[PDB]
Design a protein around this ligand. Sequence first.
Ligand SMILES: CCCCCCCCCCCCCCCCCC(=O)OC[C@H](COP(=O)([O-])OCC(O)COP(=O)([O-])OC[C@@H](COC(=O)CCCCCCCCCCCCCCCCC)OC(=O)CCCCCCCCCCCCCCCCC)OC(=O)CCCCCCCCCCCCCCCCC
Ligand SMILES: CCCCCCCCCCCCCCCCCC(=O)OC[C@H](COP(=O)([O-])OCC(O)COP(=O)([O-])OC[C@@H](COC(=O)CCCCCCCCCCCCCCCCC)OC(=O)CCCCCCCCCCCCCCCCC)OC(=O)CCCCCCCCCCCCCCCCC
Ligand SMILES: CCCCCCCCCCCCCCCCCC(=O)OC[C@H](COP(=O)([O-])OCC(O)COP(=O)([O-])OC[C@@H](COC(=O)CCCCCCCCCCCCCCCCC)OC(=O)CCCCCCCCCCCCCCCCC)OC(=O)CCCCCCCCCCCCCCCCC
Ligand SMILES: CCCCCCCCCCCCCCCCCC(=O)OC[C@H](COP(=O)([O-])OCC(O)COP(=O)([O-])OC[C@@H](COC(=O)CCCCCCCCCCCCCCCCC)OC(=O)CCCCCCCCCCCCCCCCC)OC(=O)CCCCCCCCCCCCCCCCC
Ligand SMILES: CCCCCCCCCCCCCCCCCC(=O)OC[C@H](COP(=O)([O-])OCC[N+](C)(C)C)OC(=O)CCCCCCCCCCCCCCCCC
Ligand SMILES: CCCCCCCCCCCCCCCCCC(=O)OC[C@H](COP(=O)(O)OCCN)OC(=O)CCCCCCCCCCCCCCCCC
Ligand SMILES: CCCCCCCCCCCCCCCCCC(=O)OC[C@H](COP(=O)(O)OCCN)OC(=O)CCCCCCCCCCCCCCCCC
Lengths: 78, 78, 78, 78, 62, 80, 63, 65, 65, 129, 129, 77
Amino acid sequence: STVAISVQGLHYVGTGLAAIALAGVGLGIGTIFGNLLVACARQPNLTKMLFNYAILGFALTEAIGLFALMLAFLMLFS
Amino acid sequence: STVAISVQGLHYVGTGLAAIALAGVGLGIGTIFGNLLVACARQPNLTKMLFNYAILGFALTEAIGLFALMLAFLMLFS
Amino acid sequence: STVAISVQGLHYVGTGLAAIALAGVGLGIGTIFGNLLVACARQPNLTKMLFNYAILGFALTEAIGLFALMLAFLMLFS
Amino acid sequence: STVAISVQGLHYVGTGLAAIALAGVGLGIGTIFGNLLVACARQPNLTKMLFNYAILGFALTEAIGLFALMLAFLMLFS
Amino acid sequence: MLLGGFVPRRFSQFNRDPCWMFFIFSVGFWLGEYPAMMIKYNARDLVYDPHRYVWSHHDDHH
Amino acid sequence: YNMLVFRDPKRRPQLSEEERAKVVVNQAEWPEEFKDFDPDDPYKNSPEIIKGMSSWNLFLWGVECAFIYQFYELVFPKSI
Amino acid sequence: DHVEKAMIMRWGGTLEDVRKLSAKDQLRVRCFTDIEKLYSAYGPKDTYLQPPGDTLPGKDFYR
Amino acid sequence: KAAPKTLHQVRNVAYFFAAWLGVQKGYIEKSANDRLWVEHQRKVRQQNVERQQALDSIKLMQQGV
Amino acid sequence: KAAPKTLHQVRNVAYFFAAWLGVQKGYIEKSANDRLWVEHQRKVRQQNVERQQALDSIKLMQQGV
Amino acid sequence: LCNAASKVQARSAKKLAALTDAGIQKTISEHNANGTDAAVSSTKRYLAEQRQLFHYRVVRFFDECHYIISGEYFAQYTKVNLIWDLRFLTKLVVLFLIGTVLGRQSIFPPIDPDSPLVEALVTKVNPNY
Amino acid sequence: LCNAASKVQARSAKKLAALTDAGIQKTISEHNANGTDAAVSSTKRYLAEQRQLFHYRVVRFFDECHYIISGEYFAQYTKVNLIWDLRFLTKLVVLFLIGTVLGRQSIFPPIDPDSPLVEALVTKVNPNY
Amino acid sequence: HFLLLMFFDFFYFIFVFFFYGVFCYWFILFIFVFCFCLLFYVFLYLLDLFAAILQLFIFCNMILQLIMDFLLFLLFV
Ligand SMILES: CCCCCCCCCCCCCCCCCC(=O)OC[C@H](COP(=O)([O-])OCC(O)COP(=O)([O-])OC[C@@H](COC(=O)CCCCCCCCCCCCCCCCC)OC(=O)CCCCCCCCCCCCCCCCC)OC(=O)CCCCCCCCCCCCCCCCC
Ligand SMILES: CCCCCCCCCCCCCCCCCC(=O)OC[C@H](COP(=O)([O-])OCC(O)COP(=O)([O-])OC[C@@H](COC(=O)CCCCCCCCCCCCCCCCC)OC(=O)CCCCCCCCCCCCCCCCC)OC(=O)CCCCCCCCCCCCCCCCC
Ligand SMILES: CCCCCCCCCCCCCCCCCC(=O)OC[C@H](COP(=O)([O-])OCC(O)COP(=O)([O-])OC[C@@H](COC(=O)CCCCCCCCCCCCCCCCC)OC(=O)CCCCCCCCCCCCCCCCC)OC(=O)CCCCCCCCCCCCCCCCC
Ligand SMILES: CCCCCCCCCCCCCCCCCC(=O)OC[C@H](COP(=O)([O-])OCC(O)COP(=O)([O-])OC[C@@H](COC(=O)CCCCCCCCCCCCCCCCC)OC(=O)CCCCCCCCCCCCCCCCC)OC(=O)CCCCCCCCCCCCCCCCC
Ligand SMILES: CCCCCCCCCCCCCCCCCC(=O)OC[C@H](COP(=O)([O-])OCC[N+](C)(C)C)OC(=O)CCCCCCCCCCCCCCCCC
Ligand SMILES: CCCCCCCCCCCCCCCCCC(=O)OC[C@H](COP(=O)(O)OCCN)OC(=O)CCCCCCCCCCCCCCCCC
Ligand SMILES: CCCCCCCCCCCCCCCCCC(=O)OC[C@H](COP(=O)(O)OCCN)OC(=O)CCCCCCCCCCCCCCCCC
């Protein structure tokens, strides 16, 4: 027989999963700053150019985080 | 047939999943405060600058942590 | 007996799983930049060729994240 | 009693799971380029040769991600 | 292998070689088919088929 | 220069600076097609294959062909 | 072939039934099929899912 | 380079901008009307569904199972 | 006065004539459709009048004068 | 069908000969000798000049904007400038109205579903239009 | 908002100076000295020339008609003329289709009242359109 | 090819049914989306072109590796 069911609590589960991807982003941030300090110690003269590149890496990694976050919020309110 | 179902306790599950996002955030902080020691020991004269960058990275990671925390609380009290 | 069931809200679950695929992509991107800083700090004259390769790696990694994101949006609209 | 049930929406769940395989592939690709940058700064004379090997590794690693993505399409389109 | 050949510097030079003339004709076809589809498939008088719910590919492949 | 992925080939110099400086340029002997020759635009003075046929005219011809291909059935529909 | 199948199934289930229509009607139906092709998976689903309360014919119209 | 005796270019730009603004006004009005009609059609379908359900309920009562 | 190397003017005139002929075709088609719809509406009104007359006749019979 | 064509050609020839513009006559004679079309050549020359004057238009636009913003334009304001500005305002208004009509793709505002005029839409003689 | 305007003006000025056309540069210099607009003057010149060349167009049309009717055009027919005629035919066809669409004021043919598609007209989401 | 087909379908949809936004006040969003779609189109075509050749290379290299695994070389004296 044809049965159609609509569960109204499964828009929460999908939202939680989309938030998990943030960990892969947050950890990625620490890695960039984990190695930035070492690079600064190795070559203190480039404290500026390295910092700019690290900001570029953080922004791009955060861009992935916000792409995932968009799915998280869409399914939370829909 | 058209059947609509509303499962009440699934708002807890979504909350729990978002908490896992903190696993990476907490780990990412440890990476920063791990390399910081190595950077300081290698170049103790630059502790202040390295310490400031470590704080910067911690703030950026914490931002993602709050994003996940925000989703968890919303799905907890909704 | 033959029973056919159609669960609606499952597409939210599948979409959230695909979002997790961005965890490695975000982490992978962060790894590239972290390695880039070390290479620049250990060979400061190559601040452009390394930057180009970092961009190339990001593009490929972004491509993988976009392949998954297509499924994430597609299932969300299925 | 013998009851046979056919749930349609499950194909979304399996599709999302396969997308998780891209997390390893995307991370794996970033690992290769990270080593490439850290290797070009140790022996820049071979940068062209290393870049060639990096690309070969990218495809082999990328090839696996396609296998998973194929399964996602198979179940998403069936 | 993309080694050499005539390469027009800009659009106006595409008429300096028959092959590029055919190429630009093809590009014109390619890009001008899209506006045609815009006008044809977003027309005011365009009407959905009343019997569209009688049958669809979705039920057939299912 | 480039047109999409098609790059214009460039002839490598063969003369040294000393020998090159001693060369006397006489554009009077050059063909009319190549005078004031510019590496960045060598075909500026090149003749048209068909007189009066511009590139834009061909582009518009292709666009008109597309419009015909998409609109002919609207004016002369045929039964199945 | 797909266009002809759509026209036949949606307008009688037989070739003669389709031929009973005029050329303009066939043009309209085929252009709607083109619309459906263009929408694919990225578009509204009311083109093939009948909303509740719709007065248009259902699947059992010709049965 | 003396001061310009005419302002043709600025006037042409203003003409284009005015036409564009009018187009935006018309587009906004049409979009609002379309949304209103979509909502009206949805309400009509809902009312039809309710009427059909009421008729089915009355027929069920007549069935008297 | 040498022979013309181009036929631009004739081509332009032909372009205008072709556009005009297409316009005539469209106008004829639209006029025919409008006439058909006018006749259909007239028939609908006539049918409505006949239905009203039949209803009035039935009501008259119910009156039974 | 032929006499009329001959008469029209003769009239046009007389008018063409009548004009006493040295440049126009010279161009006509040259094109007739070469067998080419003068009007088409003029069109192509104008299009080429406009294509080569686009950035000149941009520079003039910026210069005029600076002239107006600096207040120098209003310093020498006269009645003629007032007339031109009134013409400019009229064109702006008519263009705005035309733009609105095209934007909504209808001369009149669309009828809302709740309006009592909906019946008129239902009772259209030709629903296609 | 201002830096972008300055950058655009500078780019246009560089491009305007780059061109090596003696006539264009001379006209630009003259208009700048006089403070007038070169593009507008060119437009007015072109319109005046076209206004003075209308009867020239008529005479050329009649001459071309005589040339074609006399059969001299087909005597020297070549492949280039074939290409031009194909272009001409394509433009004629597209213009005819556009003319029909405008004449009936609808992309698609109107639906007859007896057609089964009338229901679609009745079920329009927005009757205004 | 699956990915190419899906992306081309999406590009066709947005180009045809949302180009009117160029004339509207949200034209900037459409322009950004269109530029992104063009970039993705170019990237996908380049990636596929490279990957086809690379896969053929690998396909032949597997066979050659099979052959080489059992080859024995003698030394000239
Ligand atoms: C560098 C890259 C090159 C390409 C690489 C490969 C491809 C890559 C992919 C992308 C390619 C993009 C497209 C190619 C470029 C096209 C533009 C171009 O170069 O033209 C130069 C061209 C000059 O070249 P030329 O060879 O020196 O031409 C000499 C003369 O044209 C003289 O020519 P003629 O002697 O043959 O004259 C023929 C005749 C014939 O002239 C005409 O017929 C004029 C045209 C009339 C309109 C016909 C339709 C035009 C097409 C529209 C749709 C286009 C769709 C495709 C666009 C795709 C763009 C991405 O002319 C006249 O008689 C004069 C016309 C006077 C009439 C004016 C009034 C017209 C009214 C129209 C009424 C209809 C309106 C609609 C509503 C009607 C309602 C009832 O400049 C123009 O004239 C352009 C005018 C039109 C502009 C808009 C066109 C559409 C949008 C184009 C965007 C391009 C973006 C590029 C970005 C690059 C960044 C680096
Ligand atoms: C609902 C939305 C639907 C949207 C649909 C899609 C919309 C379009 C999308 C794009 C589609 C693809 C592109 C197609 C482009 C086709 C057009 C094109 O490229 O044109 C260039 C093309 C020239 O290109 P070419 O050959 O490369 O030119 C070389 C040189 O550039 C030549 O340079 P030039 O120096 O020669 O430059 C001037 C030249 C170039 O000027 C232009 O470019 C003109 C504008 C070009 C666009 C035209 C689009 C037309 C589309 C249909 C109409 C829409 C409204 C147009 C308003 C135009 C206002 C000026 O001017 C002309 O072309 C002149 C044409 C008019 C000739 C007038 C002669 C009448 C003589 C009558 C004698 C009768 C005697 C009867 C005696 C009987 C005795 C028994 O020109 C034309 O095709 C002109 C067509 C004009 C048609 C007008 C029809 C009006 C309606 C019928 C008349 C009703 C009222 C009067 C009735 C009176 C009683 C009979
Ligand atoms: C349903 C049926 C409804 C029917 C309604 C009624 C229909 C009309 C019936 C009659 C009504 C009474 C008569 C009214 C006539 C009004 C027109 C008139 O006389 O014009 C002459 C008048 C010049 O007369 P004048 O001042 O005596 O000229 C002195 C010299 O002759 C000057 O000589 P010249 O050498 O300068 O000659 C060239 C001149 C003359 O050329 C013409 O004559 C042009 C054609 C004239 C007719 C125009 C009619 C327009 C009507 C509405 C649109 C219909 C389609 C028009 C298609 C035109 C195709 C070319 O060209 C122009 O006018 C250029 C105008 C375009 C300027 C483009 C600049 C854009 C800059 C944008 C920068 C944005 C930066 C943003 C940064 C933001 C940062 C935060 O020109 C205009 O008014 C031009 C208006 C153009 C409006 C275009 C609007 C298009 C739609 C909006 C844009 C959407 C797409 C793009 C969006 C992009 C994103 C923003
Ligand atoms: C001898 C008797 C005198 C009168 C006696 C008293 C009254 C007696 C009662 C009867 C009076 C009849 C009317 C008076 C005559 C009017 C014609 C005239 O002489 O004009 C010369 C005039 C040249 O005089 P001019 O002072 O040397 O002008 C210098 C230049 O014009 C340069 O001017 P500018 O420097 O000021 O430039 C301004 C600017 C401004 O230029 C423009 O804006 C050009 C005009 C654009 C169109 C605007 C609407 C035009 C009006 C249409 C409605 C008229 C209704 C009233 C007509 C009644 C006729 C009985 O120009 C431009 O930028 C160039 C324009 C480039 C754009 C071209 C493309 C336009 C596209 C239009 C798009 C819109 C179309 C609608 C659909 C849109 C859908 C989205 O020639 C033209 O330019 C005429 C063009 C228009 C022709 C058709 C006009 C309607 C029909 C007239 C029939 C007259 C029959 C007379 C029979 C006599 C037998 C012996
Ligand atoms: C006594 C003698 C009397 C003689 C009378 C002669 C009367 C002639 C009347 C006009 C005839 C016109 C015929 C041609 C037009 C036919 C239109 C048609 O059938 O369209 C339907 C067909 C389409 O058929 P369709 O309608 O089945 O296709 C629709 C398909 N869907 C639904 C999917 C969209 O149109 C075309 O095929 C258009 C193709 C273009 C036509 C023009 C080609 C011009 C040349 C271009 C190539 C060369 C370029 C070279 C450039 C480089 C040079 C160096
Ligand atoms: C980088 C920029 C330049 C790049 C150039 C590249 C080439 C592009 C060439 C573009 C050619 C034209 C494009 C046409 C777009 C679509 C036109 C169309 O048919 O849309 C109108 C359509 C009418 O239908 P509607 O009733 O709104 O709803 C239909 C649902 N069944 O309704 C809609 O779709 C809604 C439209 C609302 C917004 C209107 C914007 C335009 C307003 C002025 C138009 C004036 C046109 C005048 C032409 C006259 C034609 C006779
Ligand atoms: C000596 C000559 C020159 C003299 C010049 C003197 C100045 C004259 C200026 C004229 C200006 C334009 C005149 C406009 C005429 C009327 C236009 C109009 O609104 O008519 C369209 C109308 C639509 O309505 P319809 O559905 O047919 O029925 C309505 C009944 N409720 O339907 C009708 O009315 C039927 C029309 C059928 C015939 C159509 C003919 C035109 C075909 C091409 C039109 C192209 C217009 C493109 C403009 C685009 C606008 C965005």
